[PDB]
Amino acid sequence: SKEYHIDEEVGFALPNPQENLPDFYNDWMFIAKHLPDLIESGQLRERVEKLNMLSIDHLTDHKSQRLARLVLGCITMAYVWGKGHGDVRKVLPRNIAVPYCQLSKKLELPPILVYADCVLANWKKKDPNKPLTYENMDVLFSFRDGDCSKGFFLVSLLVEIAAASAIKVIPTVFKAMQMQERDTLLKALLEIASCLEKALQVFHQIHDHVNPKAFFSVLRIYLSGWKGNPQLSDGLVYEGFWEDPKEFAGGSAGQSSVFQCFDVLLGIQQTAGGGHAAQFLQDMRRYMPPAHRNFLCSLESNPSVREFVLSKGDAGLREAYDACVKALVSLRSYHLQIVTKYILIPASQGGTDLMNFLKTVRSTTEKSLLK
Numbered sequence: 342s343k344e345y346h347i348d349e350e351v352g353f354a355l356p357n358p359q360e361n362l363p364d365f366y367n368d369w370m371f372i373a374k375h376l377p378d379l380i381e382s383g384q385l386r387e388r389v390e391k392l393n394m395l396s397i398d399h400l401t402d403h404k405s406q407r408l409a410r411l412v413l414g415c416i417t418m419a420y421v422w423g424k425g426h427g428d429v430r431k432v433l434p435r436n437i438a439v440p441y442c443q444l445s446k447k448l449e450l451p452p453i454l455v456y457a458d459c460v461l462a463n464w465k466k467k468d469p470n471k472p473l474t475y476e477n478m479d480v481l482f483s484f485r486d487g488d489c490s491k492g493f494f495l496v497s498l499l500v501e502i503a504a505a506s507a508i509k510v511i512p513t514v515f516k517a518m519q520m521q522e523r524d525t526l527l528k529a530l531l532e533i534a535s536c537l538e539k540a541l542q543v544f545h546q547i548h549d550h551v552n553p554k555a556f557f558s559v560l561r562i563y564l565s566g567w568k569g570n571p572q573l574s575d576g577l578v579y580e581g582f583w584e585d586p587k588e589f590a591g592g593s594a595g596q597s598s599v600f601q602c603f604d605v606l607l608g609i610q611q612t613a614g615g616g617h618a619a620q621f622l623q624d625m626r627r628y629m630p631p632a633h634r635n636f637l638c639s640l641e642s643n644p645s646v647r648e649f650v651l652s653k654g655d656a657g658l659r660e661a662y663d664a665c666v667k668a669l670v671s672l673r674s675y676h677l678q679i680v681t682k683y684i685l686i687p688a689s690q691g692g693t694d695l696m697n698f699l700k701t702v703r704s705t706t707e708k709s710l711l712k
C-alpha cells in the first residue's frame with residue numbers, strides 16, 4: 342500500500358505535517374494563525390481583503406501544498422461565516438480565491454476545507470520522540486477560542502489512526518482468499534476486528550476534550566459548507582476563478598477514507614441504491630485525496646470478502662467476519678450517542694435528517710452480519 346500514499350503508522354492521515362510555509366506566504370500564515378483574535382475583533386474580513394494575490398509557484402513539495410490548502414481553507418471558513426452568528430460573505434476575494442482554486446485543482450480537491458485538511462493534516466507532535474498520544478499532540482489551526490477544535494480534530498485523528506492499524510491487514514485478507522489459506526484469512530479478520538475495537542475505545546476521549554455547547558453553537562458553524570445551504574442558496578463566488586457561484590459540501594467524517602474502506606472490504610453497501618445515505622458517502626469520496634479515492638475503487642475491484650465467507654459454511658470464518666462487522670456497529674452506535682449529546686440535546690436548548698442518515702448507515706452495517 343504505497344502508490345496509495347498510505348502511511349504504515351498513521352494510515353490515511355498525512356504523516357509529519359509541515360507546520361510552517363515559505364516566507365513568501367507569511368501574510369497567509371499570519372491570518373490563519375490568528376483567526377480567533379482576528380474574528381473576535383472584527384478585522385478578519387478586512388485583513389483578508391487587504392491581501393496581495395500570491396503565487397502558489399513557491400509551494401514546492403506536497404506537504405507544503407497541504408499546509409497551504411489548510412491555511413487557505415481555514416481562512417475561507419473564517420471569511421464566509423465570520424463571527425458565526427449570521428453575517429455571511431458570499432464572495433471570496435480574488436486575492437485568496439484564485440490561489441486557493443489553483444492549489445485545490447492542483448491537488449484534485451474541492452476548494453473547501455475538508456477532513457483531509459482539518460484532521461488528516463492539522464496536527465503536530467509536541468516531542469517527536471514521544472508517541473502519538475493526545476498529550477503529545479496539538480492542532481495547527483482553530484477558528485475561535487473555546488471552539489474545542491483541538492479536541493474534536495485530535496480525537497478524530499486518533500480514532501483514524503487506531504483504525505489505520507487494520508489497513509495493513511487488507512492485503513493478507515485478499516491473498517489468503519486467493520491462495521485459499523483458511524487459517525490465515527481467519528486470523529487476519531480477527532486482527533482487523535481487534536483494530537476496529539480499539540478505535541472505539543479511543544473515541545471515548547471525546548468527552549474529555551469536547552464541549553457540547555461549543556461543538557454545536559460554534560465549531561459546527563465554521564465546518565459548514567455551501568451545498569443546499571439557505572445562507573448561500575447558490576454557492577460561493579470564487580472571484581477571479583469561476584464566473585458562476587459553486588456549491589461544495591462542508592467537512593464531514595463521511596469524507597474519511599478508513600471507515601469507507603471497511604464498509605467496502607466487508608461488502609457493506611453504504612453506496613448502493615441511490616438512497617440519500619449512499620449518494621452522500623459516494624459524493625464525499627470526491628473530497629478525499631485522489632490516492633485515497635483510488636484505494637477505495639481498487640478494493641471494489643477485488644473478490645468480495647463477504648461472498649467468500651458466505652460461501653464456505655465455516656462457522657469460524659462467519660464469526661471472524663462478524664467480529665469485524667460488529668465493531669463497525671459498535672462504533673456507529675457509540676457515534677449516535679455522541680451525536681445525541683453534542684447536537685440533538687444542545688439543538689433543544691434540522692437535526693432529524695442527521696439521525697436518519699446515521700441510523701441508515703448503521704442499519705445497513707448491522708444488516709450485514711451473518712447471525
Ligand code: HEM
Nearest residue numbers: 496497500501551556593594595600673679680683695702
Ligand atoms: C462531537 C463529536 C462528533 C460529532 C458531534 C459527530 C457528529 C457527526 C454527524 C452529525 C455526522 C453526520 C454526517 C455528516 O454530517 O457529515 C457525522 C458523521 C460521521 N461521523 Fe461523526 N461526529 C463526531 C465525532 C466523530 C468521530 C470521533 C468519528 C470517528 C472517528 C466520527 C465518525 C463519523 C463518521 C464515519 C461519519 C460518517 C457516517 C458513518 O459512516 O457512520 N465522528 N458525525
Ligand SMILES: Oc1ccc(CNc2cc(Br)cc3[nH]ncc23)cc1
Nearest residue numbers: 456459460561564565591592593594
Ligand atoms: O452542520 C454540521 C457541519 C458539520 C458536522 C460534522 N462534521 C464533521 C467534521 C469532521 Br472534520 C469530522 C467529523 N466526524 N463526524 C462528523 C464530522 C455536523 C453538522
